[PDB]
Amino acid sequence: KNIESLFDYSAGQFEFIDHLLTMGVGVHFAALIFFLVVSQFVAPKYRIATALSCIVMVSAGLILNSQAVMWTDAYAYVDGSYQLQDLTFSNGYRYVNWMATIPCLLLQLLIVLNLKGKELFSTATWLILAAWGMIITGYVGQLYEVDDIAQLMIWGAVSTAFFVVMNWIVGTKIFKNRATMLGGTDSTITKVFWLMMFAWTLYPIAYLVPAFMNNADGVVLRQLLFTIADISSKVIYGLMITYIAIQQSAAAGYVPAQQALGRI
Ligand SMILES: *C/C=C(C)/C=C/C=C(C)/C=C/C1=C(C)CCCC1(C)C
Ligand SMILES: CCCCCCCC/C=C\CCCCCCCC(=O)O
Ligand SMILES: [Cl-]
Ligand SMILES: [Cl-]
């Protein structure tokens, strides 16, 4: 049901995708260790924001690892090209994983925005409902990326509606609570918003690849887009969230944070 199943791959195409996914694994687990060791310099009220990055690193790292092994399982070098064998490859499992990772990305944002209690619970709930609506309708959509392009587009339109509404909630909370933020992170959080708009928008572009480049090179392009998007939306994003957590910790008087920033 996925366009990946339609083609044979050159050694070059096959190895590049393998390397992309493998590099993706290494980057996420490398970052995991960074987030782990810096977590001790985060004040208690923000420390969960950094823990969520650890959770995202392993979750994303495991899905990339799984995709890579699925890739090598599904294809074998036969008569001059990599051809589909008995096992299958699908991006569908990425969509399932987003059900967990996207709420984590959103939650760590709300935390450094200094949301608390009732407003935190209600905002998170609406955000998670919006994200799940987006992910589920998108998941259904890509089931048709070979059989019914028109259906892919319509489900994608519905998914985009959830996407836009989700982004509106995010933008609204960011620009409203920007003023509450310490240590100059009121400026930093603005760049985080634009990072999200950029990085998250790569995913619907990848989703549409079967519509504008239905060939083996389009398969490579999609994996390339996912890699750029994953690293940007999880790793670079996580680094900015953690930086914001540490800076606000130090400004709030948390001594290990102040000491940490003093060494650099
Ligand atoms: C770490 C993974 C992240 C942040 C994934 C985000 C995914 C999206 C923003 C996907 C959105 C989609 C649309 C807006 C339309 C097509 C269907 C989706 C699910 C690919
Ligand atoms: C934050 C951005 C992270 C970027 C991660 C991607 C790094 C490697 C990117 C690809 C370089 C281009 C490789 C050339 C493709 C060769 C085509 C092919 O053989 O299939
Ligand atoms: Cl605290
Ligand atoms: Cl993920």
UniProtKB/TrEMBL annotation:
Primary subcellular site in the record, as a coarse category: membrane
Signal peptide annotation: none
InterPro entries the UniProt entry points to: Arc/bac/fun_rhodopsins
One term of GO molecular function: photoreceptor activity
A Pfam entry, by short name: Bac_rhodopsin
Transmembrane portions of the chain: 19-38, 50-72, 92-113, 120-140, 152-171, 192-212, 224-246
Keywords: Chromophore, Membrane, Photoreceptor protein, Receptor, Retinal protein, Sensory transduction, Transmembrane, Transmembrane helix
Location of this chain's protein in the cell: Membrane
Entry-linked SMART domains: Bac_rhodopsin
Biological process annotations from GO: phototransduction
Gene3D superfamilies: Rhodopsin 7-helix transmembrane proteins
Assigned GO CC terms: membrane
Family classification: Belongs to the archaeal/bacterial/fungal opsin family.
The protein, known as: Chloride pumping rhodopsin
Native organism taxonomy: Bacteria, Pseudomonadati, Bacteroidota, Flavobacteriia, Flavobacteriales
Encoding gene (name): ClR
